[PDB]
Amino acid sequence: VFHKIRNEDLIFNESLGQGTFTKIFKGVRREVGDYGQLHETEVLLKVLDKAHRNYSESFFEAASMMSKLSHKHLVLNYGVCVCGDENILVQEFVKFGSLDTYLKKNKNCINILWKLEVAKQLAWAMHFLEENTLIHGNVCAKNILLIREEDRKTGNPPFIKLSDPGISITVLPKDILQERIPWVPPECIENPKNLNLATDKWSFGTTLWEICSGGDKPLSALDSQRKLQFYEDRHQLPAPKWAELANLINNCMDYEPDHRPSFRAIIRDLNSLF
Ligand SMILES: *S(O)(O)Oc1cccc(C(=O)n2nc(Nc3ccc(S(N)(=O)=O)cc3)nc2N)c1
């Protein structure tokens, strides 16, 4: 199901961070490309923790489901490595990394048309998954990767890709799900079996908030318990200073899952502004 990649062809380099029960490294893979030519291609290496090996089922399924579909806005997986005592995903290395760190580093420089253009690309990706009834389950700005920046010469827009969702929130512990508030929908915080395509409409709304809030994290100042009570009080995220998308955020973040707008209608609202 996954292309098998040789240990000897994978050189692990610098730590780039970590996700849920994973460590992330920038890497180097030696490979025969097209025409027989040998390449040294940089790769991203996602290693499942040596202590949480029980989650390997979901870990690789999440990369597997995305990999079965091919789309310009979904990150490419090259495969796994036959290491034995390790579980390593070999994924495409995106030049500029996660969108949330990028938005911090350019707070006072991303204008509204940049945020709009990134929102349309993400909504296009989500609509694609929706047509295929594939649930992502972890839509956030950390899982958005910037392939290219705005070519202020050609006025060329930024291009983004959506990374894999990682271990499902259906098997992950509550504490993890409660720290993922307000990306994890209230219904999944009440019962993780509520994971549905509507979950991705809620998380897209929270991502749109992050894209409009210069790398700021929603409910960061709130501890797990207070975040849990934010949902019990049916509260809504504060409107971003750049409030050109606050209505779409509130419409996508509807406490009633079946009232959440389709990605087709979201794209139409995104195209109506400007
Ligand atoms: S999550 O899994 O914690 O989010 C996450 C963390 C690290 C890497 C990735 C990821 O999927 N990915 N990142 C890159 N490229 C990249 C480029 C530059 C940096 S930086 N700012 O630290 O210099 C980081 C990462 N490519 C991929 N596939 C997800």
mmCIF file of N, CA and C in Angstrom, residues 93-210:
data_model
loop_
_atom_site.group_PDB
_atom_site.id
_atom_site.type_symbol
_atom_site.label_atom_id
_atom_site.label_comp_id
_atom_site.label_asym_id
_atom_site.label_seq_id
_atom_site.Cartn_x
_atom_site.Cartn_y
_atom_site.Cartn_z
ATOM 1 N N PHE A 93 9.036 17.345 1.263
ATOM 2 C CA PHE A 93 9.518 18.420 2.113
ATOM 3 C C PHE A 93 9.110 19.751 1.498
ATOM 4 N N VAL A 94 8.213 20.434 2.149
ATOM 5 C CA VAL A 94 7.682 21.701 1.666
ATOM 6 C C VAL A 94 8.590 22.825 2.133
ATOM 7 N N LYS A 95 8.907 23.751 1.229
ATOM 8 C CA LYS A 95 10.025 24.660 1.472
ATOM 9 C C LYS A 95 9.809 25.515 2.721
ATOM 10 N N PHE A 96 8.655 26.170 2.838
ATOM 11 C CA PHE A 96 8.468 27.205 3.848
ATOM 12 C C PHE A 96 7.729 26.736 5.096
ATOM 13 N N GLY A 97 7.477 25.442 5.241
ATOM 14 C CA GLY A 97 6.872 24.908 6.447
ATOM 15 C C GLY A 97 5.461 25.395 6.759
ATOM 16 N N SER A 98 5.048 25.061 7.983
ATOM 17 C CA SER A 98 3.697 25.302 8.483
ATOM 18 C C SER A 98 3.245 26.750 8.299
ATOM 19 N N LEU A 99 1.936 26.913 8.095
ATOM 20 C CA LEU A 99 1.373 28.230 7.835
ATOM 21 C C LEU A 99 1.300 29.067 9.105
ATOM 22 N N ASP A 100 1.092 28.430 10.253
ATOM 23 C CA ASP A 100 0.939 29.183 11.492
ATOM 24 C C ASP A 100 2.240 29.879 11.907
ATOM 25 N N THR A 101 3.387 29.190 11.802
ATOM 26 C CA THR A 101 4.661 29.868 12.042
ATOM 27 C C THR A 101 4.903 30.952 10.994
ATOM 28 N N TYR A 102 4.570 30.672 9.734
ATOM 29 C CA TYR A 102 4.762 31.666 8.680
ATOM 30 C C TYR A 102 3.955 32.933 8.950
ATOM 31 N N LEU A 103 2.695 32.783 9.384
ATOM 32 C CA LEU A 103 1.843 33.947 9.635
ATOM 33 C C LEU A 103 2.388 34.796 10.780
ATOM 34 N N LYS A 104 2.947 34.159 11.819
ATOM 35 C CA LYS A 104 3.621 34.932 12.859
ATOM 36 C C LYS A 104 4.757 35.756 12.268
ATOM 37 N N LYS A 105 5.621 35.117 11.478
ATOM 38 C CA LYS A 105 6.812 35.786 10.968
ATOM 39 C C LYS A 105 6.472 36.916 9.996
ATOM 40 N N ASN A 106 5.263 36.949 9.453
ATOM 41 C CA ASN A 106 4.855 38.056 8.592
ATOM 42 C C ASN A 106 3.527 38.649 9.063
ATOM 43 N N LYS A 107 3.418 38.950 10.364
ATOM 44 C CA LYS A 107 2.173 39.479 10.925
ATOM 45 C C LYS A 107 1.694 40.701 10.155
ATOM 46 N N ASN A 108 2.466 41.772 10.213
ATOM 47 C CA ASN A 108 2.028 43.061 9.703
ATOM 48 C C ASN A 108 2.279 43.211 8.207
ATOM 49 N N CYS A 109 2.390 42.094 7.481
ATOM 50 C CA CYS A 109 2.716 42.124 6.058
ATOM 51 C C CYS A 109 1.798 41.304 5.164
ATOM 52 N N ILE A 110 0.993 40.394 5.703
ATOM 53 C CA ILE A 110 0.033 39.650 4.893
ATOM 54 C C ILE A 110 -1.234 40.496 4.799
ATOM 55 N N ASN A 111 -1.553 40.959 3.599
ATOM 56 C CA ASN A 111 -2.746 41.774 3.430
ATOM 57 C C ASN A 111 -3.954 40.849 3.286
ATOM 58 N N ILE A 112 -5.122 41.422 2.999
ATOM 59 C CA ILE A 112 -6.345 40.625 3.009
ATOM 60 C C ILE A 112 -6.400 39.698 1.795
ATOM 61 N N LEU A 113 -5.891 40.152 0.649
ATOM 62 C CA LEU A 113 -5.937 39.330 -0.552
ATOM 63 C C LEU A 113 -5.065 38.080 -0.426
ATOM 64 N N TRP A 114 -3.989 38.138 0.358
ATOM 65 C CA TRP A 114 -3.200 36.936 0.635
ATOM 66 C C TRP A 114 -4.009 35.931 1.451
ATOM 67 N N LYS A 115 -4.663 36.399 2.522
ATOM 68 C CA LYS A 115 -5.487 35.520 3.353
ATOM 69 C C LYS A 115 -6.643 34.923 2.560
ATOM 70 N N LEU A 116 -7.251 35.729 1.692
ATOM 71 C CA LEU A 116 -8.341 35.256 0.854
ATOM 72 C C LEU A 116 -7.864 34.153 -0.076
ATOM 73 N N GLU A 117 -6.711 34.369 -0.706
ATOM 74 C CA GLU A 117 -6.179 33.428 -1.673
ATOM 75 C C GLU A 117 -5.753 32.123 -1.013
ATOM 76 N N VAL A 118 -5.236 32.190 0.212
ATOM 77 C CA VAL A 118 -4.925 30.967 0.943
ATOM 78 C C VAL A 118 -6.209 30.264 1.373
ATOM 79 N N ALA A 119 -7.220 31.031 1.777
ATOM 80 C CA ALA A 119 -8.502 30.443 2.155
ATOM 81 C C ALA A 119 -9.158 29.724 0.980
ATOM 82 N N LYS A 120 -9.054 30.279 -0.232
ATOM 83 C CA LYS A 120 -9.668 29.614 -1.382
ATOM 84 C C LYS A 120 -8.949 28.313 -1.699
ATOM 85 N N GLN A 121 -7.626 28.315 -1.626
ATOM 86 C CA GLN A 121 -6.887 27.090 -1.891
ATOM 87 C C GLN A 121 -7.272 25.996 -0.903
ATOM 88 N N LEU A 122 -7.304 26.332 0.388
ATOM 89 C CA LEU A 122 -7.726 25.371 1.406
ATOM 90 C C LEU A 122 -9.162 24.913 1.195
ATOM 91 N N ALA A 123 -10.068 25.840 0.908
ATOM 92 C CA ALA A 123 -11.456 25.445 0.677
ATOM 93 C C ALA A 123 -11.566 24.537 -0.542
ATOM 94 N N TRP A 124 -10.791 24.824 -1.599
ATOM 95 C CA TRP A 124 -10.735 23.949 -2.766
ATOM 96 C C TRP A 124 -10.290 22.543 -2.398
ATOM 97 N N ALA A 125 -9.257 22.425 -1.565
ATOM 98 C CA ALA A 125 -8.789 21.118 -1.109
ATOM 99 C C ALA A 125 -9.870 20.401 -0.315
ATOM 100 N N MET A 126 -10.510 21.115 0.615
ATOM 101 C CA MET A 126 -11.565 20.531 1.431
ATOM 102 C C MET A 126 -12.764 20.102 0.589
ATOM 103 N N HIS A 127 -13.127 20.903 -0.422
ATOM 104 C CA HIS A 127 -14.226 20.516 -1.297
ATOM 105 C C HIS A 127 -13.880 19.239 -2.038
ATOM 106 N N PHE A 128 -12.602 19.065 -2.360
ATOM 107 C CA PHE A 128 -12.164 17.873 -3.072
ATOM 108 C C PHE A 128 -12.339 16.635 -2.202
ATOM 109 N N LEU A 129 -11.896 16.718 -0.943
ATOM 110 C CA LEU A 129 -12.116 15.627 -0.002
ATOM 111 C C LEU A 129 -13.609 15.368 0.203
ATOM 112 N N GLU A 130 -14.418 16.430 0.225
ATOM 113 C CA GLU A 130 -15.853 16.281 0.445
ATOM 114 C C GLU A 130 -16.524 15.552 -0.710
ATOM 115 N N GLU A 131 -16.138 15.874 -1.949
ATOM 116 C CA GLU A 131 -16.630 15.129 -3.100
ATOM 117 C C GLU A 131 -16.265 13.651 -3.006
ATOM 118 N N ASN A 132 -15.147 13.325 -2.362
ATOM 119 C CA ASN A 132 -14.716 11.945 -2.209
ATOM 120 C C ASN A 132 -15.156 11.339 -0.892
ATOM 121 N N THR A 133 -16.026 12.037 -0.154
ATOM 122 C CA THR A 133 -16.419 11.728 1.219
ATOM 123 C C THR A 133 -15.272 11.199 2.068
ATOM 124 N N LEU A 134 -14.109 11.841 1.994
ATOM 125 C CA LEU A 134 -12.984 11.491 2.843
ATOM 126 C C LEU A 134 -12.860 12.508 3.977
ATOM 127 N N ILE A 135 -12.910 12.021 5.207
ATOM 128 C CA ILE A 135 -12.777 12.873 6.378
ATOM 129 C C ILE A 135 -11.298 13.087 6.676
ATOM 130 N N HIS A 136 -10.891 14.347 6.832
ATOM 131 C CA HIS A 136 -9.507 14.620 7.210
ATOM 132 C C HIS A 136 -9.364 14.456 8.716
ATOM 133 N N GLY A 137 -9.953 15.382 9.475
ATOM 134 C CA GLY A 137 -10.092 15.259 10.907
ATOM 135 C C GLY A 137 -9.143 16.091 11.727
ATOM 136 N N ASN A 138 -8.236 16.822 11.099
ATOM 137 C CA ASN A 138 -7.288 17.630 11.835
ATOM 138 C C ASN A 138 -6.885 18.837 10.990
ATOM 139 N N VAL A 139 -7.874 19.623 10.571
ATOM 140 C CA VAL A 139 -7.610 20.809 9.769
ATOM 141 C C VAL A 139 -7.183 21.917 10.723
ATOM 142 N N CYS A 140 -5.945 22.400 10.567
ATOM 143 C CA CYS A 140 -5.394 23.493 11.363
ATOM 144 C C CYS A 140 -4.298 24.172 10.553
ATOM 145 N N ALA A 141 -3.871 25.354 11.017
ATOM 146 C CA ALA A 141 -2.812 26.069 10.296
ATOM 147 C C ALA A 141 -1.460 25.349 10.374
ATOM 148 N N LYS A 142 -1.203 24.600 11.443
ATOM 149 C CA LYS A 142 0.048 23.798 11.516
ATOM 150 C C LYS A 142 0.059 22.724 10.414
ATOM 151 N N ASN A 143 -1.113 22.258 9.995
ATOM 152 C CA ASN A 143 -1.186 21.167 8.985
ATOM 153 C C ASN A 143 -1.311 21.776 7.579
ATOM 154 N N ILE A 144 -1.062 23.076 7.450
ATOM 155 C CA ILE A 144 -1.052 23.735 6.113
ATOM 156 C C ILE A 144 0.399 24.103 5.802
ATOM 157 N N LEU A 145 0.892 23.676 4.648
ATOM 158 C CA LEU A 145 2.313 23.907 4.311
ATOM 159 C C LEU A 145 2.420 24.863 3.120
ATOM 160 N N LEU A 146 3.297 25.863 3.228
ATOM 161 C CA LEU A 146 3.464 26.874 2.155
ATOM 162 C C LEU A 146 4.514 26.383 1.155
ATOM 163 N N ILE A 147 4.059 25.971 -0.024
ATOM 164 C CA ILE A 147 4.971 25.473 -1.088
ATOM 165 C C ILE A 147 5.767 26.662 -1.632
ATOM 166 N N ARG A 148 5.063 27.711 -2.032
ATOM 167 C CA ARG A 148 5.723 28.900 -2.602
ATOM 168 C C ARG A 148 5.094 30.141 -1.982
ATOM 169 N N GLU A 149 5.861 31.216 -1.923
ATOM 170 C CA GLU A 149 5.347 32.490 -1.388
ATOM 171 C C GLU A 149 4.832 33.330 -2.553
ATOM 172 N N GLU A 150 4.212 34.456 -2.234
ATOM 173 C CA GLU A 150 3.696 35.350 -3.289
ATOM 174 C C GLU A 150 4.866 35.837 -4.143
ATOM 175 N N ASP A 151 4.784 35.626 -5.448
ATOM 176 C CA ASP A 151 5.820 36.136 -6.379
ATOM 177 C C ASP A 151 5.479 37.600 -6.659
ATOM 178 N N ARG A 152 5.859 38.514 -5.761
ATOM 179 C CA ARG A 152 5.527 39.958 -5.895
ATOM 180 C C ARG A 152 6.037 40.507 -7.228
ATOM 181 N N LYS A 153 6.778 39.703 -7.981
ATOM 182 C CA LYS A 153 7.181 40.131 -9.333
ATOM 183 C C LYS A 153 6.006 39.874 -10.262
ATOM 184 N N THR A 154 5.654 38.599 -10.422
ATOM 185 C CA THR A 154 4.555 38.225 -11.329
ATOM 186 C C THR A 154 3.234 38.444 -10.638
ATOM 187 N N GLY A 155 3.248 38.866 -9.372
ATOM 188 C CA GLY A 155 1.988 38.939 -8.607
ATOM 189 C C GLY A 155 1.473 37.527 -8.419
ATOM 190 N N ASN A 156 2.371 36.548 -8.522
ATOM 191 C CA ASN A 156 1.945 35.133 -8.449
ATOM 192 C C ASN A 156 1.505 34.857 -7.020
ATOM 193 N N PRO A 157 0.353 34.197 -6.822
ATOM 194 C CA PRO A 157 -0.188 33.970 -5.482
ATOM 195 C C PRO A 157 0.633 32.956 -4.714
ATOM 196 N N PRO A 158 0.493 32.908 -3.381
ATOM 197 C CA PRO A 158 1.120 31.841 -2.582
ATOM 198 C C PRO A 158 0.414 30.527 -2.897
ATOM 199 N N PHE A 159 1.115 29.411 -2.753
ATOM 200 C CA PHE A 159 0.492 28.086 -2.976
ATOM 201 C C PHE A 159 0.677 27.259 -1.714
ATOM 202 N N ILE A 160 -0.405 26.621 -1.277
ATOM 203 C CA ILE A 160 -0.362 25.837 -0.015
ATOM 204 C C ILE A 160 -0.767 24.388 -0.290
ATOM 205 N N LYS A 161 -0.370 23.496 0.607
ATOM 206 C CA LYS A 161 -0.776 22.081 0.498
ATOM 207 C C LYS A 161 -1.298 21.665 1.882
ATOM 208 N N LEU A 162 -2.152 20.650 1.930
ATOM 209 C CA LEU A 162 -2.704 20.166 3.213
ATOM 210 C C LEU A 162 -1.956 18.895 3.619
ATOM 211 N N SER A 163 -1.389 18.898 4.824
ATOM 212 C CA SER A 163 -0.632 17.734 5.342
ATOM 213 C C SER A 163 -1.578 16.643 5.844
ATOM 214 N N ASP A 164 -1.017 15.501 6.225
ATOM 215 C CA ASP A 164 -1.822 14.357 6.718
ATOM 216 C C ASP A 164 -2.388 14.682 8.098
ATOM 217 N N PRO A 165 -3.497 14.044 8.506
ATOM 218 C CA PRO A 165 -4.173 14.347 9.794
ATOM 219 C C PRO A 165 -3.543 13.660 10.995
ATOM 220 N N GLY A 166 -2.666 12.687 10.760
ATOM 221 C CA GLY A 166 -2.020 11.960 11.862
ATOM 222 C C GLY A 166 -2.979 11.039 12.577
ATOM 223 N N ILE A 167 -2.670 10.683 13.818
ATOM 224 C CA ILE A 167 -3.509 9.702 14.568
ATOM 225 C C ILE A 167 -4.929 10.263 14.725
ATOM 226 N N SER A 168 -5.945 9.432 14.514
ATOM 227 C CA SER A 168 -7.345 9.924 14.558
ATOM 228 C C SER A 168 -7.723 10.425 15.954
ATOM 229 N N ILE A 169 -8.619 11.406 16.007
ATOM 230 C CA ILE A 169 -9.114 11.943 17.301
ATOM 231 C C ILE A 169 -10.139 10.944 17.844
ATOM 232 N N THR A 170 -10.336 9.826 17.143
ATOM 233 C CA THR A 170 -11.276 8.788 17.600
ATOM 234 C C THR A 170 -10.561 7.884 18.571
ATOM 235 N N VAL A 171 -9.232 7.855 18.521
ATOM 236 C CA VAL A 171 -8.456 6.907 19.368
ATOM 237 C C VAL A 171 -7.560 7.704 20.317
ATOM 238 N N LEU A 172 -7.392 8.987 20.041
ATOM 239 C CA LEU A 172 -6.498 9.814 20.875
ATOM 240 C C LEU A 172 -7.156 10.060 22.239
ATOM 241 N N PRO A 173 -6.372 10.348 23.295
ATOM 242 C CA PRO A 173 -6.909 10.601 24.661
ATOM 243 C C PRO A 173 -7.636 11.931 24.764
ATOM 244 N N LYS A 174 -8.485 12.057 25.781
ATOM 245 C CA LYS A 174 -9.290 13.289 25.963
ATOM 246 C C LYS A 174 -8.369 14.493 26.107
ATOM 247 N N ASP A 175 -7.382 14.411 26.985
ATOM 248 C CA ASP A 175 -6.529 15.597 27.236
ATOM 249 C C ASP A 175 -6.028 16.156 25.900
ATOM 250 N N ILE A 176 -5.661 15.284 24.966
ATOM 251 C CA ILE A 176 -5.140 15.747 23.648
ATOM 252 C C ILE A 176 -6.295 16.444 22.921
ATOM 253 N N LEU A 177 -7.461 15.807 22.892
ATOM 254 C CA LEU A 177 -8.644 16.376 22.210
ATOM 255 C C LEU A 177 -9.031 17.725 22.839
ATOM 256 N N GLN A 178 -8.858 17.873 24.148
ATOM 257 C CA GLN A 178 -9.278 19.121 24.830
ATOM 258 C C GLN A 178 -8.266 20.237 24.551
ATOM 259 N N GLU A 179 -7.005 19.887 24.330
ATOM 260 C CA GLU A 179 -6.016 20.926 23.957
ATOM 261 C C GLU A 179 -6.221 21.308 22.486
ATOM 262 N N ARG A 180 -6.864 20.435 21.718
ATOM 263 C CA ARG A 180 -7.148 20.723 20.291
ATOM 264 C C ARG A 180 -8.446 21.538 20.195
ATOM 265 N N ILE A 181 -8.959 22.033 21.320
ATOM 266 C CA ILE A 181 -10.116 22.966 21.281
ATOM 267 C C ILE A 181 -9.509 24.341 20.976
ATOM 268 N N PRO A 182 -10.003 25.122 19.991
ATOM 269 C CA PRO A 182 -11.329 24.947 19.356
ATOM 270 C C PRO A 182 -11.282 24.417 17.923
ATOM 271 N N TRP A 183 -10.358 23.513 17.609
ATOM 272 C CA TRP A 183 -10.290 22.910 16.254
ATOM 273 C C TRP A 183 -11.169 21.673 16.232
ATOM 274 N N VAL A 184 -11.085 20.882 17.291
ATOM 275 C CA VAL A 184 -11.960 19.688 17.415
ATOM 276 C C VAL A 184 -13.371 20.207 17.707
ATOM 277 N N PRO A 185 -14.374 19.827 16.897
ATOM 278 C CA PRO A 185 -15.776 20.263 17.091
ATOM 279 C C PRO A 185 -16.330 19.814 18.439
ATOM 280 N N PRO A 186 -17.299 20.557 19.005
ATOM 281 C CA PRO A 186 -17.900 20.246 20.334
ATOM 282 C C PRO A 186 -18.492 18.847 20.385
ATOM 283 N N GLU A 187 -19.081 18.412 19.283
ATOM 284 C CA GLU A 187 -19.707 17.073 19.218
ATOM 285 C C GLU A 187 -18.649 15.971 19.350
ATOM 286 N N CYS A 188 -17.455 16.189 18.806
ATOM 287 C CA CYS A 188 -16.370 15.184 18.914
ATOM 288 C C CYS A 188 -15.755 15.259 20.324
ATOM 289 N N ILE A 189 -15.806 16.427 20.964
ATOM 290 C CA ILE A 189 -15.309 16.571 22.362
ATOM 291 C C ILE A 189 -16.288 15.819 23.274
ATOM 292 N N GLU A 190 -17.571 15.817 22.925
ATOM 293 C CA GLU A 190 -18.575 15.061 23.710
ATOM 294 C C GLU A 190 -18.449 13.564 23.395
ATOM 295 N N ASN A 191 -18.322 13.214 22.121
ATOM 296 C CA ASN A 191 -18.214 11.794 21.698
ATOM 297 C C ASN A 191 -17.369 11.735 20.431
ATOM 298 N N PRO A 192 -16.173 11.128 20.457
ATOM 299 C CA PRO A 192 -15.266 11.089 19.281
ATOM 300 C C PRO A 192 -15.874 10.328 18.101
ATOM 301 N N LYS A 193 -16.914 9.525 18.326
ATOM 302 C CA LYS A 193 -17.589 8.797 17.220
ATOM 303 C C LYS A 193 -18.390 9.768 16.341
ATOM 304 N N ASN A 194 -18.521 11.015 16.773
ATOM 305 C CA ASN A 194 -19.264 12.028 15.986
ATOM 306 C C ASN A 194 -18.407 12.535 14.821
ATOM 307 N N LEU A 195 -17.157 12.085 14.713
ATOM 308 C CA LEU A 195 -16.286 12.470 13.570
ATOM 309 C C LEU A 195 -17.056 12.264 12.262
ATOM 310 N N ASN A 196 -17.231 13.339 11.501
ATOM 311 C CA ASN A 196 -18.023 13.296 10.250
ATOM 312 C C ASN A 196 -17.421 14.358 9.330
ATOM 313 N N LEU A 197 -17.865 14.431 8.080
ATOM 314 C CA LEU A 197 -17.375 15.472 7.148
ATOM 315 C C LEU A 197 -17.645 16.868 7.726
ATOM 316 N N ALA A 198 -18.666 17.013 8.570
ATOM 317 C CA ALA A 198 -19.019 18.312 9.189
ATOM 318 C C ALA A 198 -17.935 18.755 10.166
ATOM 319 N N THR A 199 -17.148 17.813 10.675
ATOM 320 C CA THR A 199 -16.030 18.152 11.569
ATOM 321 C C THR A 199 -15.084 19.063 10.832
ATOM 322 N N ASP A 200 -14.869 18.815 9.539
ATOM 323 C CA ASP A 200 -13.873 19.582 8.741
ATOM 324 C C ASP A 200 -14.374 21.003 8.445
ATOM 325 N N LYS A 201 -15.681 21.222 8.464
ATOM 326 C CA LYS A 201 -16.232 22.585 8.268
ATOM 327 C C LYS A 201 -15.947 23.412 9.527
ATOM 328 N N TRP A 202 -16.093 22.805 10.702
ATOM 329 C CA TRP A 202 -15.780 23.514 11.964
ATOM 330 C C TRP A 202 -14.294 23.869 11.997
ATOM 331 N N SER A 203 -13.429 22.892 11.753
ATOM 332 C CA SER A 203 -11.964 23.099 11.833
ATOM 333 C C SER A 203 -11.487 24.099 10.774
ATOM 334 N N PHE A 204 -12.085 24.087 9.587
ATOM 335 C CA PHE A 204 -11.755 25.099 8.551
ATOM 336 C C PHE A 204 -12.032 26.491 9.098
ATOM 337 N N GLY A 205 -13.139 26.661 9.821
ATOM 338 C CA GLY A 205 -13.492 27.965 10.409
ATOM 339 C C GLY A 205 -12.460 28.431 11.403
ATOM 340 N N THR A 206 -11.953 27.512 12.213
ATOM 341 C CA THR A 206 -10.903 27.838 13.192
ATOM 342 C C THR A 206 -9.605 28.140 12.462
ATOM 343 N N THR A 207 -9.347 27.463 11.347
ATOM 344 C CA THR A 207 -8.130 27.719 10.544
ATOM 345 C C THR A 207 -8.238 29.089 9.915
ATOM 346 N N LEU A 208 -9.418 29.447 9.418
ATOM 347 C CA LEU A 208 -9.641 30.788 8.822
ATOM 348 C C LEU A 208 -9.388 31.855 9.891
ATOM 349 N N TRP A 209 -9.743 31.561 11.137
ATOM 350 C CA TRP A 209 -9.472 32.491 12.252
ATOM 351 C C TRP A 209 -7.964 32.673 12.414
ATOM 352 N N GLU A 210 -7.213 31.574 12.395
ATOM 353 C CA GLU A 210 -5.740 31.639 12.534
ATOM 354 C C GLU A 210 -5.137 32.401 11.345
#
